[PDB]
Design an enzyme around this catalytic site. Sequence first.
Site, short mmCIF file in Angstrom:
data_model
loop_
_atom_site.label_atom_id
_atom_site.label_comp_id
_atom_site.label_asym_id
_atom_site.label_seq_id
_atom_site.Cartn_x
_atom_site.Cartn_y
_atom_site.Cartn_z
CG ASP A 95 -1.79 1.20 1.49
OD1 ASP A 95 -1.86 1.89 0.79
OD2 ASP A 95 -2.56 1.06 2.12
CB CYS A 98 1.37 1.15 4.37
SG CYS A 98 2.37 -0.29 5.32
CB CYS A 101 4.45 -0.05 2.25
SG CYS A 101 3.29 -1.39 2.59
NE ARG A 125 -2.26 0.69 5.16
CZ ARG A 125 -1.81 1.67 6.02
NH1 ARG A 125 -1.40 1.29 7.21
NH2 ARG A 125 -1.85 2.84 5.59
#
Lengths: 216, 216
Positions: A95, A98, A101, A125
């Site tokens: 994502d 995120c 990430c 998400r």
Amino acid sequence: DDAAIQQTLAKMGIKSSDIQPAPVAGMKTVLTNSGVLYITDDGKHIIQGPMYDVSGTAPVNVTNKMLLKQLNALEKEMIVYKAPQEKHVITVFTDITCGYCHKLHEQMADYNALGITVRYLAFPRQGLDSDAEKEMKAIWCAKDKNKAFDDVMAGKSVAPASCDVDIADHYALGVQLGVSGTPAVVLSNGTLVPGYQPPKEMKEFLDEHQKMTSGK
Amino acid sequence: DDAAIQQTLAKMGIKSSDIQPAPVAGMKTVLTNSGVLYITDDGKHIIQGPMYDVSGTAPVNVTNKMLLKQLNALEKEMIVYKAPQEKHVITVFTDITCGYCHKLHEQMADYNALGITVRYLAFPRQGLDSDAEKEMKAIWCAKDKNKAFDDVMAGKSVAPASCDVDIADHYALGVQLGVSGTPAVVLSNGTLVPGYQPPKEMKEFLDEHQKMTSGK
């Protein structure tokens, strides 16, 4: 029973259903955005799953096998960062919003230097009618997906490409595979390793996993 | 659009639907008991088909290609009469109540002697909730399908075996393939040759068809 099934989903509260064959008489595989279900042809009974085939020595997860073929069907839509000397290939549901990430992506060179190839699928998400889906749809629609992903992750503004790619398909696969967070690593055997592992710990895990699951 | 589609079928009057991917953006393949349709993801537009892929020199029927993979998926459920020296393999949609199907079956040895292998699928012309479906379901459920088919065709009484085989699937494939009568011969390229050809005329046709369609 193939119409009655969708009447059952049309009171279970289900959107992006896909009905597949199952290896059990009278039952069918139902892929949803919430997971894989097994429904009888008449649509009267739901079983959660997963399903196993024990007509042999070991139990084979048939659900995982079927999702492994979906995953491989999506390889064209993956953002792949090749390791120069590939020892392992991992699929990451990621994502762009995120933090972990970002942390993982910033270390891509480190992953690759250790011989880990990383193939990205989109997993917002926030779910499907979200800004993250929109952004990531645009990234996955770029001429160079790698550049778009790098640029957006780096804070650079990138005008939105458009194409037929559907992040819903990536997201649903993730949910079906057990994903409940990003970044989520899926192994070549279909195994989910939830969350963040630094490049070094990642190499060591994958090496060990390979040893243990190689088959002598 | 995958739920909206079944709402459209639920006013088009459609029973045994199966939704498949299509090679055209925003559209999906819909297999019914009445034929293959193409529907937009939102379920608002139907196109009759078939579909062709002209990203190359010739037009490839993608509908026929997809039905050719269904057909091959059903090989386990075929009653196969092997030619000792196989030159051709044909698939026949047959009905145990049909007179020309008797005439053809009585000449099976003649077909085989000419090197034509015949693989049977069930196609009740009376449709699906019929005695022919019931009889043929029983035949296709026998331990020895060849013997059951021979016996029933010869007038012999055969106690009804039961299994998970579904003659609806054979029948729907036939309708999807253009079948509107029995016996109907489908070639290895997916071509329908409607009706009865005696063994000799059949050999000559298949030889010629092979010459013309071989690809030099």
